Scaffold this motif. Structure first.
Motif, PDB file in Angstrom:
ATOM      1  N   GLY A 186       0.797  -1.214   0.000  1.00 58.35           N
ATOM      2  CA  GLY A 186       0.000   0.000   0.000  1.00 58.35           C
ATOM      3  C   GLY A 186       0.831   1.265   0.000  1.00 58.35           C
TER       4      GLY A 186
ATOM      5  N   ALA B 249      -0.226   4.992   0.451  1.00 57.19           N
ATOM      6  CA  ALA B 249      -0.618   6.006   1.431  1.00 57.19           C
ATOM      7  C   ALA B 249      -2.078   6.351   1.168  1.00 57.19           C
ATOM      8  CB  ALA B 249       0.228   7.279   1.361  1.00 57.19           C
ATOM      9  N   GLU B 250      -2.685   7.071   2.112  1.00 54.07           N
ATOM     10  CA  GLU B 250      -4.071   7.499   1.980  1.00 54.07           C
ATOM     11  C   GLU B 250      -4.204   8.967   2.363  1.00 54.07           C
ATOM     12  OE1 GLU B 250      -6.452   4.798   4.252  1.00 54.07           O
ATOM     13  OE2 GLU B 250      -6.321   3.180   2.768  1.00 54.07           O
ATOM     14  N   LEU B 251      -5.301   9.563   1.903  1.00 52.45           N
ATOM     15  CA  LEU B 251      -5.396  10.988   1.617  1.00 52.45           C
ATOM     16  C   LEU B 251      -5.837  11.835   2.810  1.00 52.45           C
ATOM     17  CD1 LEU B 251      -5.928   9.463  -1.357  1.00 52.45           C
ATOM     18  CD2 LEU B 251      -6.937  11.673  -1.938  1.00 52.45           C
TER      19      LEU B 251
ATOM     20  N   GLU C  63       5.362   9.954   7.747  1.00 48.74           N
ATOM     21  CA  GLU C  63       3.896   9.898   7.586  1.00 48.74           C
ATOM     22  C   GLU C  63       3.364  11.097   6.803  1.00 48.74           C
ATOM     23  OE1 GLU C  63       2.279   9.543  11.467  1.00 48.74           O
ATOM     24  OE2 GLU C  63       2.785   7.422  11.723  1.00 48.74           O
TER      25      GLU C  63
ATOM     26  N   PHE D 295       4.280  11.282   3.212  1.00 49.21           N
ATOM     27  CA  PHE D 295       4.776  11.012   1.871  1.00 49.21           C
ATOM     28  C   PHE D 295       3.924   9.945   1.195  1.00 49.21           C
ATOM     29  CE2 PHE D 295       9.148  12.264   3.667  1.00 49.21           C
ATOM     30  CZ  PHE D 295       8.855  13.593   3.454  1.00 49.21           C
TER      31      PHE D 295
ATOM     32  N   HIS E 133       4.864   7.440  -1.356  1.00 48.04           N
ATOM     33  CA  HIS E 133       5.414   6.102  -1.498  1.00 48.04           C
ATOM     34  C   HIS E 133       5.967   5.620  -0.157  1.00 48.04           C
ATOM     35  CE1 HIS E 133       6.896   2.758  -3.912  1.00 48.04           C
ATOM     36  NE2 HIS E 133       8.016   2.818  -3.216  1.00 48.04           N
TER      37      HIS E 133
END
Ligand code: CDL
Ligand code: 3PE
Lengths: 119, 56, 176, 68, 157, 60, 55, 59, 459, 128, 87, 171
Positions: D44, D46-48, D61, D63, D65
């Motif tokens: 995974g 990252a999430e927005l 926490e 970035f 990639h």
């Protein structure tokens, strides 16, 4: 043609100066000779993405020809009647431009030689 | 359309495989002219389609 | 400018003028048979005064013939596509690798070609065998202290190969 | 009996260097490309989301990639 | 290896000694050796050659360096790098040189003068203006959606 | 120790790393700021970046 | 040594003569006309091109 | 046959993956130049016609 | 930074207490480990420079030059045998240790906070290369070469010391932030013109400019490969980085007083591209090529646009890579045949069949093949100078035409057309030279893929 | 017939119309024969130092090394500073430099005065 | 592209195109025949002969050779120098 | 995804074509077969990978900074106010460059969407582009390379002095 020889040999007057053609006052011996229909649908002329120097007269034949050429893509040679009609309309537009040219040319010739040689 | 961009980019990328292929070959494949010819023919026969969609 | 003599002669100069006039008239004249006619005309015009005993008259008419030919040459003569200046100029020079190479290979590739390299070994022994003594004896033997020429006599004495042979024998095939 | 013998300069040292170079870039090029493929296909990115009230993240926490 | 007296400092004087030394050292005939001379431009005492030498030396003599035109003992004229084929063709031209440049400059001048006579004298058929209907195609130029209404119309002729 | 552990590892190292010169940070910051100033009605990029009330001009 | 027993030669020459027979008309049919065609030429102006080539 | 299989399925799959999801990440990316509509046409999306082109005369 | 400094000190006794037939592997291995360690430096971000505490910092201008230097060291350390691989054990260890100490002062010079520390480490960078090229110069005028070298560089670099002590004792200390953040514009006196002339003329000596360019070519053609590559790449781009530091002061006077240096740089760029079109002695053509590119760099530095600084640093790093490679190729050709000239050893397309690919790739990155970094540098310098003046683009493209001309003439002169068939001694290529080629041209093309690194502080 | 071929420093003089080949003397024959003797001795020494199977390295031509030593390091000695060399150096060295410096003064004066008047096209002129 | 040239065949081709030339006989003509002594033709016609050989085979000969061929066998030897006529 | 409020994309306009042919239509069966061969397996593989991603969760956060008070309230030499002020100003300079880049991308998009009628439905976006670039040309242009913050302040003072002189001579 021979008009080129006349402009390069004779007087510069009766041969009109090119691309400065509106010289004499319009509706001179016309009076009430104009309609200028222009039924070529300006907003639909925007909606159909034509080319500049084509947003002019005889545009609706181009609209219908591009419509049938969009519609009949496997028909590689079917759309030719509307093509010839658009050719015919721009042919008559060239006729109108020639008649306007010799309108201005003969008004210049007859009226200016009349005044400058019977003053 | 996804097909249009997809086929144009694969016509670009079919013109990428033989160069990296005989950069990474290390075995003298003698049918390499045949290889280049058939990948150029495949690139053309994929390139005719998005032009057909364009004129369509 | 020649390896044998210092000058050619008058006759060689008239001769080369004939050859160059014939070649440039080939390049000038197509259809080859009107060319054959005009080449016979050129042969007759040289047959005008072949019978001259004078020498200053000969070299003076030769100079005037050079003038007339330089007035009647052609800009692109039909130089053959084998000769330098033409279309070859060693056209296939890509594969004219000389034979001081081909010995700097790994012995795996030399194991791939056993018979040719064994025969190259016997050629190299033939080079080394009578290289020193006989060739130094013949080259220190025959000339005067002034060499005065650029040829060399063959090994006419008794035995082995004529001297200074290696790079004239060993050469590319001129179609590699 | 038709063929001639051509005189090639050398092929051994050329193919030796290129075989060693392709093998010695291939030896840890392919495992690293396989590894980065496994990372961005399994772990995974990252999430927005954003920062809540009165809660601090570290200097990571931030970035896209995950290996970055 | 290389002798100290196979360098070449100092010019031509005197006429017995240094000319004999240049004959011994440059591998040339005595009278074929000519310095430039020294007008203060350096040059050592390096010889003068016939200066063209590369589209000369017809290739059927078969000397030792075919693409370099050496002979391993030639004095190698001072401007050698400007002379090898791929640089400058010092061939005898089949016509002239000044007559060539007069023909070429006359031709270029004639064509540019006919271009100038064209530039002052245009050509045009009997043809009027293209009638752009909507105020010379207003509202699709580089602005003015509401600023300047400019009334101008064509008349049916 | 010159190619197999240096070159491809350096390629993966320089391929991605934090936001160099705060680049994509500036991208997302500019997106939020343009949406902010479009929502608050004022034109984007207010000129005179320093406050024109915060000046003490040398009079003449 | 004049030899053309060759599939490569006849394929390439064949396909480009097929191209030089059809592809000009195939291009010239189905393009959107982005200009005004003139189409109104005088006597001795449309004819003079082929006249000059024949002479 | 396997040449045609790999060279019309593998880069097509890779690029068609690359031209959905990374193009739907990055916003200002591949963009069209607009399909032209005519007075004798309709709109496929909502469903309404543009009213047809007006009178012809003096053919 | 001291974690990037102290293993170079600890790398010095490695060479001493490594025994015979063992120094080579240990030095190469551990210098490549240092290359990884310096590849771990790149962290710099956004607003400020990166401080490596109080003694040290790095802008994003010193960082690519530093990583370039520590990458260039193992390349050189493998490059520098076969002309001293048969010499003595103690002198060999002395040579390798002198190269390591030279690298140490290079990193000391690039990582400087105070310009006094920068100047001390500048002439500390000067002193070992002197010894190296004078001792192993391998030609009869290496004495004159090293003598002109040290005398030009000291006699130009000396008033910089007086000017920097003056800026020390009139405007506080010499942090680059505190040389920044506090500098008042110094107006147009004549003393300001002399101080500007002192600093800029010292680094003009180090570039070189056109009036002082004969400093270079003897110190390349009469010098071994290690001192040549260190000299060209790191010393010329080190002088460039030094001017990029010190040009922050004295802005209102460089406009009025910087016209003639632009002039001498442009006309010398043209005449130097002309001078290296016709010469023999193959090694020297790359030296005058470097003089041409550094005159282009000096035009780019003395005009003061951020576009110009980005093009400046790109041209610096790309030309360092290209010139170091092409010097290594000329070394390979001289190790083949002991002539150093140009017209003699032609051919070499038949033989050495893949060395031609490296001559081709080096000559095309010297040609500014357009995805490469070299054309990025030259292009943004041309853009900034056309913004500076509307007529200078003729000189730039004239440099471009003649640069392509002499580079491709070098390519099709020595390695095109005909073996002279009296050479008959050269052996085919070793794996070492091709390994050095793959050390050269993989980082250049990888930077051509991702070039957002090497652009300068005004990114 | 022909205009007798004027020569130049580009148009080479061919072997046909020399015309001085045709003034044959014993002097010219002795010169050409001794020239042939010189090239003969040089080719003989080359072929003796060329064909040996033990000779590994290059031929080591002293004429090429003589040309390089004349061309590279024999420039500065010998030399005397004369009137001609000084005038030619000051004509080729400072002349075109002060020419381009004058025209840069001209272009920069025009640009400075124009943008001080403010009549420049910098509605958007960002990338300076 | 090169048809198989042998010695005796190219000798027959040279002697054939000599035999096609008019003013010498096919009767008293062989390989060991001369061009100046027994046939008695001049140097001018000898260079016409050399031009015929050049125009058939398609390459010139240098003028260092042009005086000293004089018989078909040495012509065959020089063409075997040029083409390397073997397997 | 992103915000369409900040990236204007005008709504779709697609007609329904009308044959008027019976050959018919090779590209329609071609795009149906292309969907059946490519559009389904890419969806299947993406669904596999999306399950493998969203089984666990990561987070990136938009790094946000506070507001330094002023450079105008900073002192003469007195560094540790100026450092905050200049780095805050430099971050504003970077984000203003990205504002210019995004508005230029809007101008490119308005060019490419509108067809050959370039001057239809782009005059307002061209107008706001010229507005923001007039502000940028006025504010950040003619300073050169060594901007810190002080040269922008000097330019601002000299420019409003010129405006004061112009309006005082106009009055
Ligand atoms: C790490 C990732 C890269 C790993 C590369 C491994 C080596 C590849 C290899 O073995 O290639 C075979 C090839 C050798 O072929 P060979 O059969 O041994 O002999 C060929 C001859 O020696 C004659 O040599 P040549 O004809 O192969 O050399 C021509 C040369 C000429 O260079 C170009 O044409 C470059 C400009 C192309 C246009 C750009 C727009 O290179 C190319 O054509 C490469 C084009 C792409 C380069 C730029 C990307 O290797 C090279 O030519 C050396 C490397 C060249 C640069 C590669 C850069 C890759 C990135
Ligand atoms: C603008 C500045 C331009 C400067 C050009 C400098 C050229 C220097 C190098 C000359 C050179 O390498 O010449 C080689 C080539 C030889 O030409 P040539 O031997 O006649 O070839 C025909 C068949 N062999 O000769 C050439 O390639 C000639 C040089 C190129 C063409 C020059 C003329 C057109 C451009 C004029 C200026 C604009």
């Amino acid at each position: 043609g021979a008009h080129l020889a006349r402009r390069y040999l004779g007087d510069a007057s009766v041969e009109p100066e090119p691309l400065r053609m509106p010289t004499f006052p319009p509706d001179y011996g016309f009076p009430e000779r104009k309609e200028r229909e222009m039924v070529a649908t300006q907003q639909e002329m925007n909606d159909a993405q034509l080319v500049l120097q084509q947003r002019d007269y005889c545009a609706h034949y181009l609209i219908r020809f591009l419509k049938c050429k969009r519609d009949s893509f496997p028909n590689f040679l079917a759309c030719k009647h509307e093509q010839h009609d658009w050719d015919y309309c721009e042919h008559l537009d060239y006729v109108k431009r020639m008649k306007e040219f010799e309108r201005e040319r003969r008004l210049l010739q007859r009226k200016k030689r009349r005044e400058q040689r019977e003053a | 359309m996804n097909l249009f961009s997809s086929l144009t980019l694969v016509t670009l990328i079919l013109l990428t495989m033989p160069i990296a292929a005989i950069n990474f070959n290390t075995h003298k494949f003698t049918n390499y002219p045949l290889y280049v010819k058939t990948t150029i023919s495949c690139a053309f026969i994929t390139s005719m389609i998005p032009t057909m969609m364009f004129i369509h | 400018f020649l390896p044998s003599a210092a000058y050619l002669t008058h006759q060689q100069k008239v001769l080369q003028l004939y050859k160059r006039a014939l070649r440039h008239l080939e390049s000038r004249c197509v259809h080859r048979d009107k060319y054959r006619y005009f080449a016979c005309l050129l042969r007759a015009r040289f047959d005008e005064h072949k019978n001259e005993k004078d020498m200053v008259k000969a070299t003076q008419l030769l100079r005037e013939a050079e003038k007339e030919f330089w007035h009647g040459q052609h800009p692109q003569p039909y130089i053959f596509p084998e000769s330098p200046g033409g279309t070859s100029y060693e056209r296939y020079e890509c594969y004219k690798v000389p034979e001081w190479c081909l010995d700097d290979w790994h012995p795996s590739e030399k194991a791939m070609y056993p018979d040719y390299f064994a025969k190259r070994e016997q050629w190299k022994k033939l080079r080394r065998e009578s290289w020193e003594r006989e060739v130094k004896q013949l080259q220190e033997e025959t000339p005067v202290g002034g060499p005065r020429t650029e040829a060399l006599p063959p090994a006419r004495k008794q035995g082995d190969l004529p001297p200074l042979w290696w790079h004239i024998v060993t050469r590319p095939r001129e179609r590699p | 009996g038709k063929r001639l013998f051509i005189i090639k300069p050398s092929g051994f040292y050329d193919k030796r260097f290129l075989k060693l170079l392709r093998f010695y870039i291939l030896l840890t090029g392919i495992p690293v490309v396989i590894g980065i493929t496994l990372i961005n296909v399994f772990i995974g990115e990252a999430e927005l989301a954003e920062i809540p009230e009165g809660y601090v993240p570290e200097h990571w926490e931030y970035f896209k990639h995950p290996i970055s | 290896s290389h002798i100290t007296k196979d360098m070449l400092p100092g010019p031509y004087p005197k006429t017995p000694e240094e000319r004999a030394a240049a004959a011994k050292k440059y591998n040339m005939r005595v009278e074929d050796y000519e310095p430039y001379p020294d007008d203060g431009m350096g040059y050592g005492d390096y010889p003068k050659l016939p200066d063209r030498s590369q589209q000369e030396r017809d290739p059927w003599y078969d000397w030792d360096h075919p693409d370099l035109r050496l002979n391993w003992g030639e004095p190698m004229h001072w401007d050698l790098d400007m002379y090898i084929r791929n640089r400058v063709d010092t061939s005898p031209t089949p016509v002239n040189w000044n007559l060539m440049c007069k023909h070429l400059f006359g031709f270029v001048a004639f064509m540019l003068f006919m271009f100038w006579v064209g530039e002052t004298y245009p050509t045009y058929q009997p043809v009027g203006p293209k009638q752009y209907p909507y105020n010379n195609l207003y509202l699709e130029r580089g602005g003015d959606p509401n600023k300047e209404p400019e009334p101008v119309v064509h008349y049916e002729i | 120790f010159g190619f197999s552990i240096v070159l491809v590892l350096g390629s993966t190292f320089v391929a991605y790393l934090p936001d160099y010169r705060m680049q994509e940070w500036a991208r997302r910051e500019a997106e939020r700021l343009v949406k902010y100033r479009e929502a608050h009605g004022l034109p984007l990029m207010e000129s005179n970046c320093f406050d024109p009330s915060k000046i003490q001009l040398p009079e003449d | 040594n004049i030899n053309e027993n060759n599939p490569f030669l006849i394929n390439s020459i064949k396909r480009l003569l097929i191209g030089s027979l059809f592809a000009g008309f195939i291009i010239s049919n189905n393009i959107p006309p982005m200009t005004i065609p003139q189409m109104t030429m005088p006597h001795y102006l449309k004819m003079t091109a082929l006249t000059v080539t024949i002479l | 046959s396997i040449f045609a299989f790999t060279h019309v399925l593998i880069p097509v799959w890779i690029i068609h993956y690359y031209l959905k999801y990374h193009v739907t990440t990055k916003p200002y990316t591949i963009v069209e130049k607009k399909p032209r509509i005519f007075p004798g046409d309709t709109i496929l999306e909502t469903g309404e016609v543009i009213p047809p082109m007006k009178e012809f005369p003096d053919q | 930074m001291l974690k990037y400094i102290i293993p170079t000190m600890m790398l010095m006794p490695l060479t001493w207490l490594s025994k015979n037939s063992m120094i080579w592997i240990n030095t190469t291995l551990h210098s490549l480990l240092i290359s990884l360690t310096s590849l771990l430096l790149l962290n710099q971000f956004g607003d400020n420079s990166l401080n490596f505490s109080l003694t040290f910092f790095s802008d994003s201008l010193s960082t690519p030059l530093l990583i370039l230097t520590m990458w260039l060291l193992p390349l050189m350390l493998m490059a520098s045998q076969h002309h001293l691989s048969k010499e003595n054990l103690a002198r060999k260890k002395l040579f390798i240790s002198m190269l390591i100490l030279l690298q140490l002062f290079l990193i000391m010079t690039f990582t400087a906070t105070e310009l006094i520390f920068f100047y001390i480490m500048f002439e500390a960078t000067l002193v070992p290369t002197l010894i190296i090229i004078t001792r192993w110069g391998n030609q009869t005028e290496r004495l004159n070469a090293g003598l002109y070298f040290l005398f030009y560089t000291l006699a130009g670099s000396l008033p910089l010391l007086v000017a920097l002590i003056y800026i020390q004792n009139t405007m506080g200390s010499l942090n680059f932030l505190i040389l920044q953040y506090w500098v008042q514009p110094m107006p147009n006196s004549w003393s300001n013109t002399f101080m500007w002339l002192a600093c800029m003329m010292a680094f003009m000596v180090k570039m070189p400019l056109y009036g002082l360019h004969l400093w270079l070519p003897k110190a390349h053609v009469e010098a071994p490969i290690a001192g040549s590559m260190v000299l060209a790449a790191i010393l010329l781009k080190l002088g460039g980085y030094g001017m990029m530091r010190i040009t922050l002061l004295l802005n209102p006077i460089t406009d009025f007083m910087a016209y003639p240096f632009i002039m001498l740089s442009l006309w010398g760029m043209i005449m130097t591209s002309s001078i290296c079109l016709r010469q023999t002695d193959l090694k020297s053509l790359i030296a005058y090529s470097s003089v041409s590119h550094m005159a282009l760099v000096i035009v780019a530095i003395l005009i003061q646009t951020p576009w110009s600084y980005m093009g400046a640093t790109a041209l610096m790093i790309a030309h360092g890579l290209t010139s170091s490679m092409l010097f290594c190729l000329a070394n390979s050709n001289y190790e083949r045949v002991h002539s150093r000239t140009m017209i003699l050893a032609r051919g070499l397309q038949t033989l050495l069949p893949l060395m031609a690919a490296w001559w081709l790739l080096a000559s095309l990155t010297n040609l500014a093949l357009p995805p490469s970094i070299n054309l990025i540098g030259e292009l943004f310098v041309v853009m900034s100078t056309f913004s500076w003046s509307n007529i200078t683009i003729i000189l730039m493209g004239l440099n471009m035409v003649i640069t392509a001309l002499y580079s491709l003439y070098m390519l099709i002169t020595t390695q095109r057309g005909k073996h002279t068939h009296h050479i008959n001694n050269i052996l085919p290529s070793f794996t070492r030279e091709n390994a050095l080629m793959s050390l050269h041209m993989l980082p250049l093309l990888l930077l051509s893929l991702n070039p957002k690194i090497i652009l300068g502080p005004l990114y | 017939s022909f205009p007798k071929y004027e020569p130049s420093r580009l148009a080479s003089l061919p072997t046909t119309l020399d015309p001085a080949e045709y003034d044959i003397s014993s002097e010219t024959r002795k010169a050409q024969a001794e020239r042939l003797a010189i090239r003969s001795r040089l080719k003989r020494e080359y072929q003796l130092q060329y064909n040996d199977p033990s000779r590994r390295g290059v031929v080591e031509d002293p004429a090429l090394i003589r040309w390089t030593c004349a061309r590279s390091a024999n420039v500065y000695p010998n030399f005397r500073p004369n009137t001609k060399t000084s005038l030619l150096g000051a004509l080729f060295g400072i002349g075109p430099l002060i020419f381009w410096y004058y025209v840069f003064k001209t272009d920069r004066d025009r640009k400075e005065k124009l943008i001080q008047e403010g009549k420049l096209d910098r509605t958007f002129n960002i990338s300076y | 592209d090169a048809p198989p040239l042998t010695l005796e065949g190219i000798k027959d081709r040279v002697l054939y195109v000599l035999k096609l030339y008019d003013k010498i006989d096919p009767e008293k003509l062989s390989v060991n025949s001369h061009f100046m002594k027994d046939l008695g033709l001049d140097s001018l016609d000898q260079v016409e002969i050399i031009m015929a050989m050049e125009d058939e085979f398609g390459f010139e000969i240098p003028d260092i050779d042009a005086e000293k061929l004089m018989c078909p066998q040495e012509i065959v030897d020089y063409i075997a120098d040029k083409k390397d006529v073997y397997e | 995804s992103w915000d369409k409020d900040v990236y204007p994309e005008p709504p779709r306009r697609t007609p329904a074509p009308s044959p008027q042919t019976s050959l018919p239509n090779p590209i329609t069966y071609l795009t149906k077969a292309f969907d059946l061969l490519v559009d389904r397996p890419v969806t299947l593989v993406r669904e596999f990978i999306e399950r493998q991603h969203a089984k666990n969760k990561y987070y990136y956060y938009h790094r946000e900074f506070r507001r330094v008070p002023d450079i105008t309230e900073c002192h003469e030499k007195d560094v540790l106010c100026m450092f905050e002020a200049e780095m805050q100003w430099k971050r504003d300079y970077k984000v203003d460059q990205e504002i210019v880049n995004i508005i230029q991308e809007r101008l490119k998009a308005c060019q490419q969407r509108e067809g050959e009628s370039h001057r239809q439905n782009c005059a307002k976006e061209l107008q706001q582009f010229t507005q923001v670039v007039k502000a940028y040309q006025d504010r950040y242009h003619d300073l050169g390379a060594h901007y810190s913050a002080r040269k922008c302040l000097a330019k601002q003072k000299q420019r409003m002095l010129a405006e004061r002189k112009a309006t005082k001579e106009a009055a």
